[PDB]
Design a protein around this motif. Structure first.
Motif, PDB file in Angstrom:
ATOM      1  N   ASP A 218       0.847  -1.192   0.000  1.00 41.08           N
ATOM      2  CA  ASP A 218       0.000   0.000   0.000  1.00 41.08           C
ATOM      3  C   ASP A 218       0.884   1.244   0.000  1.00 41.08           C
ATOM      4  O   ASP A 218       1.999   1.223   0.527  1.00 41.08           O
ATOM      5  N   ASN A 219       0.397   2.319  -0.609  1.00 39.23           N
ATOM      6  CA  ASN A 219       1.150   3.565  -0.646  1.00 39.23           C
ATOM      7  C   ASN A 219       0.351   4.734  -0.091  1.00 39.23           C
ATOM      8  O   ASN A 219      -0.544   5.264  -0.756  1.00 39.23           O
ATOM      9  N   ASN A 241      -5.136   9.933  -0.566  1.00 46.50           N
ATOM     10  CA  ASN A 241      -5.780   8.663  -0.844  1.00 46.50           C
ATOM     11  C   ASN A 241      -7.148   8.692  -0.181  1.00 46.50           C
ATOM     12  O   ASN A 241      -7.325   9.375   0.826  1.00 46.50           O
ATOM     13  N   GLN A 249     -10.121   1.892  -0.469  1.00 45.72           N
ATOM     14  CA  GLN A 249      -9.378   0.798  -1.086  1.00 45.72           C
ATOM     15  C   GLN A 249      -9.891  -0.549  -0.586  1.00 45.72           C
ATOM     16  O   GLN A 249     -10.570  -0.624   0.441  1.00 45.72           O
ATOM     17  N   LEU A 285      -5.619  -1.934  -3.811  1.00 48.46           N
ATOM     18  CA  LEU A 285      -4.999  -0.939  -2.940  1.00 48.46           C
ATOM     19  C   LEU A 285      -4.896   0.446  -3.573  1.00 48.46           C
ATOM     20  O   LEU A 285      -4.664   1.431  -2.867  1.00 48.46           O
ATOM     21  N   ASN A 287      -5.989   3.723  -4.524  1.00 51.13           N
ATOM     22  CA  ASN A 287      -7.045   4.686  -4.203  1.00 51.13           C
ATOM     23  C   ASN A 287      -6.536   6.131  -4.122  1.00 51.13           C
ATOM     24  O   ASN A 287      -6.902   6.888  -3.220  1.00 51.13           O
ATOM     25  N   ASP A 316      -2.228   4.302  -6.946  1.00 49.37           N
ATOM     26  CA  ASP A 316      -2.215   4.834  -5.599  1.00 49.37           C
ATOM     27  C   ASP A 316      -1.469   6.168  -5.555  1.00 49.37           C
ATOM     28  O   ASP A 316      -1.458   6.848  -4.531  1.00 49.37           O
TER      29      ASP A 316
HETATM   30 CA   LIG Z   1      -3.937   2.831  -1.160  1.00 50.57          CA
END
Ligand SMILES: [Ca+2]
Length: 448
Positions: A218-219, A241, A249, A285, A287, A316
């Protein structure tokens, strides 16, 4: 069934528009101009002390001009001012904001003088602040010249020691003129955190941690604040995000038609491929959002607003949020790496500036050039003239905007440090844009 359609009352960078980019992009309408290698110079004044205390040539990365409220380049006591991230080419992740300046009428890259770092190491510890004492890096933002003639900086407080916590931050940069040809950073004041995510509209670092983000890839982002005004209101538009209530997400997002666009057959085929494949988690992930908050006159948070646009399932990372008004319309831009994207035919070496247009600041944003493509850069990172962090600077007159970017410039021979790329022009006409034919400007030029 599991299929649904929720727009969350906001705009979206859709899979349908993104998949059209590979067959559209190979045109000089969108290609970042080829740059002349033989003429590329390091920023001569970009010198500073390394971690040991020896004076070295810095690598200079993300940069932004001091702007007027409307986005045009400010003039400060006859000077143009550029804030830039810089650090030691070797000592890993260490970025600080430097202040460069140039006589308004000077043109050469050699004309850019260096006023040094905006902040001293000690500055973060002075204010009574919830976050600043934990800062490990200074990341990108914007600069505005206030009505009162003050230099007002917005940047990102990154805390590597707090799981990559990112906080939209502000300070007034106090300036003086020691002589006729020098600007000095005296110090900072009104240095404070503004916003680090709420959880419902924008993801927090806590949510990132709790969901095991460092194990899932995830970022988390909450950065690159861009100051803009509209109708007496002050805003920051920033990279973020989604939170829990504006399209979070997760796997459910892969069933949301709003992120796909196109027809049902497109949705069904694209979704099936996503769920089967090695990009399932990456898409889930993804988003990214371009967020917006309103500020008070003292630059404290007034209101957390819904995002302007999201890139759910696509990426992301939508970076370098940018927004300005032109011909009565609002233009919204963001940079995006192909490497972080989940789109068929978009690859590791593809780098983009995407753009959108709306009739109002918070209205529906529609893609420029049908797909959202504005700029395409696909030079290998090893190339001397690789450019990144493309940013559109609006101009006082005309339909052209100036594109600035940094050029990593890591050639086998000198010059050898990340520098200002030659700037160039992009024409804006309604919902259409185009790279201006054969008009490559000086390195780091801001205005035409
Ligand atoms: Ca994310």
């Amino acid at each position: 069934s599991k299929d649904f359609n929720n727009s969350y009352g906001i705009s979206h960078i859709t899979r349908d528009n993104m998949v059209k980019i590979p067959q559209q992009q190979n045109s000089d309408q969108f290609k970042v101009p080829a740059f002349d290698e033989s003429t590329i110079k390091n920023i001569a004044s970009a010198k500073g002390k390394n971690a040991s205390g020896n004076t070295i040539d810095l690598d200079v990365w993300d940069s932004w001009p001091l702007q007027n409220a409307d986005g045009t380049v400010a003039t400060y006591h006859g000077y143009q001012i550029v804030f830039a991230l810089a650090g030691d080419p070797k000592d890993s992740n260490d970025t600080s904001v430097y202040l460069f300046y140039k006589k308004a009428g000077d043109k050469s890259i050699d004309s850019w003088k260096n006023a040094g770092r905006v902040f001293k190491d000690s500055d973060k510890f002075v204010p009574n602040d919830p976050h600043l004492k934990n800062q490990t890096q200074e990341w990108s933002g914007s600069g505005t010249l206030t009505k009162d003639g003050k230099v007002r900086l917005f940047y990102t407080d990154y805390s590597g020691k707090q799981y990559g916590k990112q906080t939209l931050t502000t300070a007034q940069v106090n300036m003086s003129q020691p002589n006729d040809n020098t600007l000095k950073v005296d110090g900072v004041e009104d240095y404070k955190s503004i916003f680090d995510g709420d959880g419902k509209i924008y993801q927090t670092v806590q949510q990132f941690i709790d969901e095991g983000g460092y194990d899932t890839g995830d970022n988390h982002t909450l950065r690159d604040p861009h100051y803009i005004e509209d109708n007496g209101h002050k805003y920051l538009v920033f990279e973020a995000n989604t939170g829990t209530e504006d399209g979070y997400q997760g796997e459910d997002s892969l069933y949301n038609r709003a992120y796909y666009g196109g027809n049902n057959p497109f949705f069904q085929s694209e979704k099936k491929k996503l769920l089967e494949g090695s990009n399932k988690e990456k898409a889930s992930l993804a988003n990214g959002a371009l967020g917006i908050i309103e500020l008070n006159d003292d630059y404290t948070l007034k209101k957390v607003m819904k995002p302007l646009i999201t890139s759910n399932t696509v990426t992301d990372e939508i970076e370098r949020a940018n927004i300005f008004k032109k011909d009565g319309k609002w233009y919204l831009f963001t940079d995006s790496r192909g490497s972080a994207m989940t789109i068929d035919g978009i690859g590791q070496d593809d780098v983009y500036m995407l753009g959108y247009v709306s009739n109002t600041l918070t209205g529906k944003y529609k893609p420029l050039n049908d797909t959202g493509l504005v700029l395409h850069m696909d030079l290998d990172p090893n190339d001397k003239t690789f450019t990144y962090s493309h940013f559109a600077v609006p101009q006082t007159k005309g339909d052209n905007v100036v594109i600035t970017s940094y050029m990593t410039n890591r050639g086998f021979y000198e010059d050898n440090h990340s520098t200002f790329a030659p700037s160039f022009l992009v024409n804006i006409d309604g919902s259409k844009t185009s790279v201006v034919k054969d008009r490559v400007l000086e390195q780091g030029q801001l205005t035409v």
